[PDB]
């Protein structure tokens, strides 16, 4: 239904002793959904610009580099590429 | 499980389902939801890190909305990313 439990699991890694209120968890869910929609929409247009019928990790990466500022873009690219490399190793 | 193979906590299967259901393209490559789930997880961590720091500076034991607001506004990059949400 939402990302709350996964947000909580990430919270337990970054700040194990810190809780989160129900209202703040609602805001976090709003941020994740908004970022999801922004990247997927941009990857959709890029695949259209490239005359490709499929959204691949190439379009996700390009959307990420163009939508996020500065250091966030660099680290998000590092994290996405690491996940894909682990995933395809398996 | 897809998320475990990618080393992620975020649900790759659901991100895949949401990419397919949203009529973003005709097809979705297997790597696309992995990459995207990884980016969402990282962005979540960065927000919680700074909101968590604000709660601790506030001598508080949990993150509340005011801590998220503080974290976004006082971080140039998160403010650029989310300041319009």
């Amino acid at each position: 239904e939402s990302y709350s439990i996964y947000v909580y699991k990430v919270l337990k890694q970054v700040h194990p002793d810190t809780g989160i209120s129900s209202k703040a968890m609602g805001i976090m869910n709003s941020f994740v959904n908004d970022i999801f929609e922004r990247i997927a929409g941009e990857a959709s247009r890029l695949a259209h610009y490239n005359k490709r019928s499929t959204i691949t990790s190439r379009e996700i990466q390009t959307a990420v580099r163009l939508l996020l500022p500065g250091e966030l873009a660099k680290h998000a690219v590092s994290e996405g590429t690491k996940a894909v490399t682990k995933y395809t190793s398996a | 499980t897809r998320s475990s193979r990618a080393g992620l906590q975020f649900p790759v299967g659901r991100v895949h389902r949401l990419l397919r259901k949203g009529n973003y393209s005709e097809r979705v490559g297997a790597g696309a939801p992995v990459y995207l789930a990884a980016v969402l997880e990282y962005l979540t961590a960065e927000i919680l890190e700074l909101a968590g720091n604000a709660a601790r500076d506030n001598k508080k034991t949990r993150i509340i909305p005011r801590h998220l607001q503080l974290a976004i506004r006082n971080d140039e990059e998160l403010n650029k990313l989310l300041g319009r949400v």
Binding site: Y8, A24 | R62
Partner: peptide
Amino acid sequence: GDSESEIEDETFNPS
């Protein structure tokens, strides 16, 4: 003075 905050906005409980 934190169960007062809990009344206003309850803590997210994963279980």
